[PDB]
Enzyme design. Sequence first.
Site, PDB file in Angstrom:
ATOM      1  N   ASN B   9      32.210  36.778  32.124  1.00  0.00           N
ATOM      2  CA  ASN B   9      32.310  37.990  31.302  1.00  0.00           C
ATOM      3  C   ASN B   9      33.787  38.252  31.015  1.00  0.00           C
ATOM      4  O   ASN B   9      34.519  38.729  31.890  1.00  0.00           O
ATOM      5  CB  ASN B   9      31.656  39.189  32.004  1.00  0.00           C
ATOM      6  N   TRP B  10      34.232  37.934  29.789  1.00  0.00           N
ATOM      7  CA  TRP B  10      35.628  38.158  29.416  1.00  0.00           C
ATOM      8  C   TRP B  10      35.971  39.642  29.300  1.00  0.00           C
ATOM      9  O   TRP B  10      37.151  40.004  29.343  1.00  0.00           O
ATOM     10  CB  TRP B  10      35.924  37.461  28.086  1.00  0.00           C
ATOM     11  N   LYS B  11      34.974  40.500  29.140  1.00  0.00           N
ATOM     12  CA  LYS B  11      35.184  41.932  28.909  1.00  0.00           C
ATOM     13  C   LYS B  11      36.024  42.072  27.632  1.00  0.00           C
ATOM     14  O   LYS B  11      35.906  41.252  26.714  1.00  0.00           O
ATOM     15  CB  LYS B  11      35.755  42.579  30.167  1.00  0.00           C
ATOM     16  N   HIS B  99      25.672  46.477  31.842  1.00  0.00           N
ATOM     17  CA  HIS B  99      26.846  46.368  32.697  1.00  0.00           C
ATOM     18  C   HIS B  99      27.277  47.756  33.153  1.00  0.00           C
ATOM     19  O   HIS B  99      27.173  48.737  32.408  1.00  0.00           O
ATOM     20  CB  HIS B  99      28.011  45.678  31.980  1.00  0.00           C
ATOM     21  N   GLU B 101      30.057  49.106  33.393  1.00  0.00           N
ATOM     22  CA  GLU B 101      31.004  49.776  32.510  1.00  0.00           C
ATOM     23  C   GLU B 101      30.297  50.453  31.342  1.00  0.00           C
ATOM     24  O   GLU B 101      30.752  51.502  30.867  1.00  0.00           O
ATOM     25  CB  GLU B 101      32.059  48.774  32.032  1.00  0.00           C
ATOM     26  N   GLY B 177      36.302  44.532  39.932  1.00  0.00           N
ATOM     27  CA  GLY B 177      37.730  44.570  39.679  1.00  0.00           C
ATOM     28  C   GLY B 177      38.582  45.125  40.801  1.00  0.00           C
ATOM     29  O   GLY B 177      39.798  45.250  40.621  1.00  0.00           O
ATOM     30  N   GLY B 238      34.235  38.263  36.521  1.00  0.00           N
ATOM     31  CA  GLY B 238      35.062  39.159  35.736  1.00  0.00           C
ATOM     32  C   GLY B 238      36.391  38.523  35.371  1.00  0.00           C
ATOM     33  O   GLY B 238      36.432  37.552  34.611  1.00  0.00           O
ATOM     34  N   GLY B 239      37.481  39.045  35.941  1.00  0.00           N
ATOM     35  CA  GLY B 239      38.816  38.605  35.552  1.00  0.00           C
ATOM     36  C   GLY B 239      39.063  37.112  35.697  1.00  0.00           C
ATOM     37  O   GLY B 239      39.794  36.522  34.897  1.00  0.00           O
TER      38      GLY B 239
END
Lengths: 258, 256
Positions: B9-11, B99, B101, B177, B238-239
């Site tokens: 997931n690049w967000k 998600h 977020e 995160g 994530g990151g």
Amino acid sequence: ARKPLIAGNWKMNLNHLEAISLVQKIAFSLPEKYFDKVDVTVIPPFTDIRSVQTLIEGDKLLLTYGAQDVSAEDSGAFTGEISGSMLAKLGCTFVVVGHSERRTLHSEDDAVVLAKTKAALKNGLTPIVCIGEGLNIREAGEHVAYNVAQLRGSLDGLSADDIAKVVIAYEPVWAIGTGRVASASDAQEVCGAIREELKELASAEVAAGVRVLYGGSVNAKNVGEIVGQPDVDGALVGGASLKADEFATLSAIAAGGP
Amino acid sequence: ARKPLIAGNWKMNLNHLEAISLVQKIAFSLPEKYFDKVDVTVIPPFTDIRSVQTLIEGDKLLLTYGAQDVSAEDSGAFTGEISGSMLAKLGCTFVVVGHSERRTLHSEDDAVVLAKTKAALKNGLTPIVCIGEGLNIREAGEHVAYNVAQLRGSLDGLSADDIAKVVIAYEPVWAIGTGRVASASDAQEVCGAIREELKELASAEVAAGVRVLYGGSVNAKNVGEIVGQPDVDGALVGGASLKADEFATLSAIAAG
Ligand code: NA
Ligand code: NA
């Protein structure tokens, strides 16, 4: 001395192949002499923008383009959101912020619209800041006051220089999707008041330069008397923007004809 | 056995040029032999998908891809939203729904997530249905019941055949995160509970096939112990998904 502006909001319609065909047809239907007299921009879904960019840049078309929304944030952990820097790198000129559908269905209030406006400006994009009252507000006769507070909230604290880089779109909610277009005098009343409030928010000279659009059931049959009004500078077009023939025709009318 | 799945997931990161660069690097760094042992998908922003599609199809890479959100609606007057058919036309395989977020910052409830799941299935997409509890829930020891309740809400009324087409991602909010990854046993506890509940919502046979991922501060150092757990089938990253070498390494670890 304000140049007319036609912004075609496709909303959630058309895949990337259909996007290319639509833009090709618009460009072929609208003779190039008209772009000296009117700015015409298409605003496709996020997933379509790249395809529209490669077409418009590859073919050197005079249509510009933009996006339907933008994140208030810089890059980070905001799954699903699209940043101003992403849109700028795609060559977008405009971004719609605070459209009625997003204010209502996605709970964007005036403060969120302000933050999106700032993100647009930070990335060199031109935000089209949308405001507009519901039928109940209109029926109670308090529409002018309602839109003014929306304007004040959505531009709160911006400098004169910053306000000079925005576009305002007045879209009465009762005119979105309904076939019930505001009369020319209705649009003129609120768009005149918008500009008058822009005087206080950021000097008279920039107030006279900011482009104020009417949106809501705009088509080739009604665009003329609306855009002809002294305080209406253009139109934010919805469903008509998906029909190449109609969109080109109403764009040419907004320009003043041949 | 269920094939492991790594989903990056690049967000909200990377323009379409940076997207091309990252996908190229991942594909060079992960030898093709690994794709028989792990599925690996990148999930870029909407505006990157066309470039990622054309690169992956054009250069015949073995990565798949997906999107970070999808509308519950088929089309129409939903300014800013992206439909399931738009994504399917771009060749997306997966779509993340619900998600944390989006549940928090965009007021997506279980009912909205369910509707987005149905829209994904309608267009042949594989929804990655995200669930996860907050810090306070976890500190009270209520985490398992909370995630089961979220799961039942996010899949309410789906047939067994339709559940077999989803993926579940358990991402505790306190691990997103923050660097506070769930312990292997903590991930197993919830992921096992999820599979147990899938037996009721669908069937034993369907539950045995549904892939359940862990997410929340996954990286190459902690992925192995977590994905080695029997009811944990991969990771929602994530990151680390933005670092081609790290993402490739954690994928290769997940493949054994
Ligand atoms: Na005018
Ligand atoms: Na496992």
